[PDB]
Design a protein around this ligand. Structure first.
Ligand SMILES: *C/C=C(C)/C=C/C=C(C)/C=C/C1=C(C)CCCC1(C)C
Ligand SMILES: *C/C=C(C)/C=C/C=C(C)/C=C/C1=C(C)CCCC1(C)C
Ligand SMILES: CCCCCCCC/C=C\CCCCCCCC(=O)O
Ligand SMILES: CCCCCCCC/C=C\CCCCCCCC(=O)O
Ligand SMILES: [Cl-]
Ligand SMILES: [Cl-]
Lengths: 281, 281
């Protein structure tokens, strides 16, 4: 790792370290949090792992490849997180004293665009999508790029890249809302419109907490510890990925049964015009 | 920045640094390269900047939003690269002695998926694309995620994530080849099939050099310096982005004139079946 043993000299003005080839920085030696927050984070890690495990078991029984991918990444991430939750480069101890959780932002790069692809095809009916789908993806990747760059930076540079990620996040939400709106008027009138509304609530609430936790954590004003920031991120990761994929799976199941019982019947409704699934011709 | 002045003590077994709050590591003080390689890198930076500037001027005269985006990111990157080419976090000096060019991998996260979106719609004829487009994007993002994780890691961990990025890169090339193949038999028989073949050559050659430069550079066996690695990356960035977008723009221009002179005429050809643009009905 890095140097953790040192001697102060010359009345606290000189620091002497062993010439063992390791790197040294006092900022890296600050506490990550309390032992209660550590154990609380370790508890939610198994809860999210057991869910991801029970999801892969459940998903194994068209193809919901989106849910399989983020669940495979999720439990692979837990295997990495169980052994090296704070080692390099799972946590990047950079030369400016920062601690940046690359394990979190890498998993966002792996899973967040896949969820928006699922959002771009909520019904799952073959090659649907739209041209705004590329807009949802180009903006979300930039959101995580600026957020990672802001978490790595300090001072004004961090604020600049945080506001750049915030503008990309605003473009992501608005385009996502218009996807949820069209999907609401496309799915049948029954219980399908219920989960579509429920998926939207889980989406904007969980996705909205990530910029909130960025401000409250060490990357911001430090009202949360590093262990405290891992607890909140696990909660909204459990909502935005495991629970959101469960509902999206439940929606596509209700769609497939509707298409097999009543056929694929479309009634054009004006909003933009949507081909709504109906029961009778 | 970090500590660059230090005193050796106790016959080279103790390193003493000022207690100024800065971080210290001997590995961060290694040379980036020779002054000739520095000036050679600075020369290609203006050449790629002037091209990106002359491209934005040229592009300003459906909508080729893909070329506009990577060109805007390219010259914004040059502004960042001109002032802080080796500052934090443009270059991440991590606690394990590594130097990782996050400026390069962040620009890849911003531009590489946008190019594959352009590849997914070479003709530019409205909402074309396919379902493999999401496969091209999910695999390429993972490629850069594993490559960044490998560049941040050391030893066996670096090799694991490099091979994980290599498998994602293999999936990316094969799906990209089938896109180029279908595009060749879809565009008209004239000069359009010429640039389509030319775009494919620039693609796999430039994209193929990035794993090659990863091995030859500091992230690999160190046959290239850090300045030497920046020169090679600039050359293949100039090919894969500026030149590839110029040809893709030239292709979409030749397609639009063909659609306005001869109309949109399709003749189904078997390969998979493709609707080929023809002149006469
Ligand atoms: C499963 C994890 C998910 C869905 C994370 C989503 C995270 C965001 C939408 C983060 C957004 C941010 C901004 C919009 C402002 C810039 C910094 C943030 C990146 C973290
Ligand atoms: C404009 C820059 C581009 C198009 C860069 C493309 C880079 C790659 C395709 C890199 C691929 C890599 C692998 C396939 C193995 C893992 C490490 C690499 C990421 C750098
Ligand atoms: C912040 C400004 C915008 C960020 C997102 C830009 C994405 C462009 C793609 C939109 C599209 O053409 O479909
Ligand atoms: C390496 C293994 C595969 C990496 C790419 C996986 C992408 C899955 C999406 C494919 C698709 O369903 O269209
Ligand atoms: Cl952390
Ligand atoms: Cl570098």
């Amino acid at each position: 790792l890095f140097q953790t043993s040192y001697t102060l000299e010359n009345q606290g003005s000189v620091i002497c370290i062993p010439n063992n080839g390791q790197c040294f920085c006092l900022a890296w030696l600050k506490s990550n949090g309390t032992n209660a927050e550590k154990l609380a984070a370790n508890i939610l890690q198994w809860i999210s792992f057991a869910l991801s495990a029970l999801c892969l078991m459940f998903y194994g029984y068209t193809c919901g490849w989106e849910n399989i991918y983020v669940a495979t990444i999720q439990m692979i991430k837990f295997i990495i997180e169980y052994f090296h939750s704070f080692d390099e480069p799972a946590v990047i101890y950079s030369s400016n004293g920062n601690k940046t959780r690359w394990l979190r932002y890498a998993s966002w790069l792996l899973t967040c665009p896949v969820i928006l692809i699922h959002l771009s095809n909520l019904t799952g009916l073959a090659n649907d999508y739209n041209k705004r789908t590329m807009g949802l993806l180009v903006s979300d990747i930039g959101t995580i790029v600026w957020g990672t760059t802001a978490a790595l930076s300090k001072g004004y540079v961090r604020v600049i890249f945080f506001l750049m990620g915030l503008c990309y996040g605003i473009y992501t939400f608005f385009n996502a809302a218009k996807v949820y709106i069209e999907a609401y008027h496309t799915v049948p009138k029954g219980r399908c419109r219920q989960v579509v509304t429920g998926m939207a609530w889980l989406f904007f609430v969980s996705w909205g907490m990530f910029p909130i936790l960025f401000i409250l954590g060490p990357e911001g004003f430090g009202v949360l510890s590093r262990y405290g920031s891992n607890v909140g991120h696990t909660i909204i990761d459990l909502m935005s990925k495991q629970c959101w994929g469960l509902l999206g799976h439940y929606l596509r199941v209700l769609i497939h049964s509707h298409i097999l019982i009543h056929g694929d019947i479309r009634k054009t409704t004006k909003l933009i015009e949507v081909e709504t699934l109906v029961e009778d011709e």
